[PDB]
Design a binder for this molecule. Structure first.
Ligand code: SOP
Ligand code: ATP
Ligand code: LAB
Ligand code: CA
Lengths: 138, 167, 367
């Protein structure tokens, strides 16, 4: 099933969280790593990611499953790119992690790297899975 | 391959007059720009990485090996660029170089040596190495740098030896 | 084999810095110029050779305001860097390049293509200059104000990742200040007008100019005594004297109207950059404002920034202006750090990745 895609994205050990989220009609997490963050994404969080206001989350930030993140790059609605790069925010010196969201025809693909994993690795990984899904008309 | 010469094992950065001879030795085997080869040897320091030379008094650079510390493995060292001068091979100097590495590393508390190879695997097994899994070496950094640093899913899509030895 | 150290190449509008990852200083610092006969060995002259022969050459800068505008000449600069300044083979080294903030998309693709197809680099990475300067200050979050020879940028950075939406650019830097000092030195009775005379004025600027804490008060001090006047000896032994021009020249960083520009000073654009950023990181930006670039070397610039930022920021806010001592070369030093980190191994674009994905790989992996 879709969990096979979480298995696939998680296989190389670079990421600590992954998910596939439908964003059309009523959004819902199609598949995600249990016990982590993306499994808890809300429709409202999906709406901010794919919404028309692409300016407020620069000053206000945004959340994924309740985890506050800072937007580094936003190309999520741009043809040929369809990706957003973020970094989590923490309190009391706890480590933060790089996140990339890519946007296909029907899904949002989300990846969170482990500590120290560079955002470029995460972005490339998420971009290739999205390209694979777009080619399948997904 | 019984070895008869008096030999010592000394870091390049303590015998800088021999650095040029050491570059000759290595580039003879693995040719690349001398600028780069001289710079690599110039990184040698007590903090690691450091380049050890097997020396003969009557002085000749008989051989060389690079020791580097290992990410997340304080007691490991990565051995690289192991070479005995081409004209002096087959006289036991390669064994004594690798054995000298063990003595040097163990005297400093290291317990495990790691290295890669393809064609010389039997040379290392002969000296007690066996297959291991990869490690990442720590490169030179200057002392002066800071150092603070639901639709159905569509279908999914579809060499060297690592040697180690306990010392 | 030893596995070899990466090269670090910082390409600026005026000066190029090249060296080896892990070193504490670049091996080569040379002008970023290509020279051709005004009216001989070559059709072109590059770097230190063009400098040597500048008397018979028209000089061109392939990098304007931090952006490559002449790719054929930039390729010459890189060829000169590898083979003449560093005397290395580029195909044997991973190469770390620096880029200006907001570097156009097609430029960084072309940068990638040239390194892999023309110089056959086994691996490469592109890092934003300001970010490297922050690394050299021992930080990963903060705002860098990078003023060089051709451009000034204010760049907020979170955990090592520049925030492009809040990056601000100011087409005002050291070469414009030199031009300005030439002009107001002429108004003092002198005549600096030629390209050669301009180089002399640059040296005057770098040796005698400073930033006043209170500009109007300093103008008054200069009018009421000679305590601020200095002397400078030209190559022909003739001696000129410089007064309030010492601080009027760098004052243009804070008052770009001195150059006829309708643009905010560096202090105010630093502030506007911070106010574009996430509410949750502004405190840290205010407390980690880092100066980089040769044009930040003026005595008094940190104090002046502290005072001006304080006037703009909330009265509660803690404001700290850090001027690292090697900030004239912090970009390069920051690249030496980064290219030496254990992590950096995973970051490279490999020659194989480039064959698979093409030049657009630079957009996915380098930010
Ligand atoms: C870690 C890395 O740098 C990557 S691996 C690359 C290793 N280095 C090279 O290939 C460079 C070219 N070769 C050399 O420089 C030398 O041959 C090396 C391999 C470094 C040292 O060997 P040599 O000096 O020529 O031989 P030598 O010490 O006299 O012989 C030591 C013992 O090792 C054996 N030996 C030498 N070369 C061998 C070989 N290729 N395979 C298996 N055994 C070999 C000898 O039979 C000898 O056995 P014993 O009588 O002591 O019991
Ligand atoms: N002590 C000094 N005082 C004032 N200015 C200086 C000093 N030293 C160097 N400069 C100026 O700094 C500029 C060069 O700085 P830098 O190398 O950071 O710029 P660049 O990287 O070549 O160009 P850019 O970053 O703008 O593309 C020159 O204009 C030079 O005159
Ligand atoms: C010592 C030095 C400083 C510098 O920043 O030099 C760079 C590069 C230089 C190139 C032309 C010059 C004749 C060659 C070398 C000068 C290099 O132009 C600059 O001097 C320009 C011209 S005037 C000025 O202030 N910046 C900046
Ligand atoms: Ca620069």
């Amino acid at each position: 099933g879709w969990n096979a895609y979480i298995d696939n994205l998680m296989a190389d050990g670079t990421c600590q969280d992954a998910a596939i989220v439908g964003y059309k009609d009523s959004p819902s997490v199609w598949a995600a790593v249990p016990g982590k963050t993306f499994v808890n994404i809300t429709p409202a969080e999906v709406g901010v990611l794919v919404g028309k206001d692409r300016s407020s989350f620069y000053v206000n930030g945004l959340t994924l499953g309740g985890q506050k993140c800072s937007v580094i790059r936003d190309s999520l609605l741009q043809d040929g790119e369809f990706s957003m790069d973020l970094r989590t925010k923490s309190t009391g010196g706890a480590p933060t992690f790089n996140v990339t969201v890519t946007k296909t025809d029907k899904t949002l693909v989300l990846l969170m790297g482990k500590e120290g994993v560079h955002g470029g690795l995460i972005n490339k990984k998420c971009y290739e899975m999205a390209s694979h899904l777009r080619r399948s008309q997904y | 391959h019984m070895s008869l010469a008096e030999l010592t094992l000394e870091p390049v950065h303590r015998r800088p007059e021999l650095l040029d001879a050491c570059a000759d030795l290595i580039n003879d085997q693995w040719p690349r720009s001398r600028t780069s080869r001289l710079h690599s040897l110039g990184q040698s320091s007590d903090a690691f990485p450091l380049c050890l030379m097997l020396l003969s008094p009557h002085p000749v650079v008989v051989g060389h090996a690079r020791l580097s510390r290992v990410l997340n493995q304080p007691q490991s060292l990565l051995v690289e660029t192991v070479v005995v001068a081409r004209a002096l091979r087959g006289r036991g100097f390669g064994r004594r170089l690798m054995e000298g590495l063990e003595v040097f590393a163990r005297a400093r508390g290291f317990r495990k040596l790691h290295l890669t190879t393809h064609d010389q695997v039997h040379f290392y097994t002969h000296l007690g190495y066996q297959l291991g899994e990869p490690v990442q070496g720590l490169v030179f950094t200057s002392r002066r740098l800071p150092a603070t640093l639901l639709p159905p899913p569509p279908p999914l899509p579809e060499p060297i030896f690592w040697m180690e030895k306990d010392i | 084999d030893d596995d070899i150290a990466a090269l670090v190449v910082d390409n600026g509008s005026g000066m190029c810095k090249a060296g080896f990852a892990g070193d504490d200083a670049p091996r080569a610092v040379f002008p970023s110029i290509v020279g051709r006969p005004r009216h001989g060995q070559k059709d072109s002259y590059v770097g230190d050779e063009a400098q040597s022969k500048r008397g018979i050459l028209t000089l061109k800068y392939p990098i304007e305001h931090g952006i490559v505008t002449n790719w054929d000449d930039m390729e010459k600069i890189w060829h000169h860097t590898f083979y003449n300044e560093l005397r290395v083979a580029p195909e044997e080294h991973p190469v770390l390049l620096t880029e200006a903030p907001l570097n156009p998309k097609a430029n960084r693709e072309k940068m990638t293509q040239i390194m892999f197809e023309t110089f056959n680099t086994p691996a490469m990475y592109v890092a934003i200059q300001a970010v490297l300067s922050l690394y050299a200050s021992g930080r990963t979050t903060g705002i860098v104000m990078d003023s060089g020879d051709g451009v000034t940028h204010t760049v907020p950075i979170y955990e090592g990742y520049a925030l492009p939406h809040a990056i601000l650019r100011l087409d005002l830097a050291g070469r414009d200040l030199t031009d300005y000092l030439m002009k107001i030195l002429t108004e003092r009775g002198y005549s600096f007008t030629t390209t050669a005379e301009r180089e002399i004025v640059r040296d005057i600027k770098e040796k005698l100019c400073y930033v006043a804490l209170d500009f109007e008060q300093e103008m008054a001090t200069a009018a009421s005594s000679s305590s601020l006047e200095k002397s400078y000896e030209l190559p022909d032994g003739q001696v000129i004297t410089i007064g309030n021009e010492r601080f009027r020249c760098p004052e243009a960083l804070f008052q770009p109207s001195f150059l006829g520009m309708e643009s905010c000073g560096i202090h105010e654009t630093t502030f506007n950059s911070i106010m574009k950023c996430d509410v949750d990181i502004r405190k840290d930006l205010y407390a980690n404002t880092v100066l980089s670039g040769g044009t930040t070397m003026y005595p008094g610039i940190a104090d002046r920034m502290q005072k001006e930022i304080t006037a703009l920021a909330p009265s509660t806010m803690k404001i700290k202006i850090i001027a690292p001592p090697e900030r004239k070369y912090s970009v390069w030093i920051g690249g030496s750090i980064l290219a030496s980190l254990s992590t950096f191994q995973q970051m490279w674009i490999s020659k194989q990745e480039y064959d698979e994905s093409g030049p657009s790989i630079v957009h996915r992996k380098c930010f």
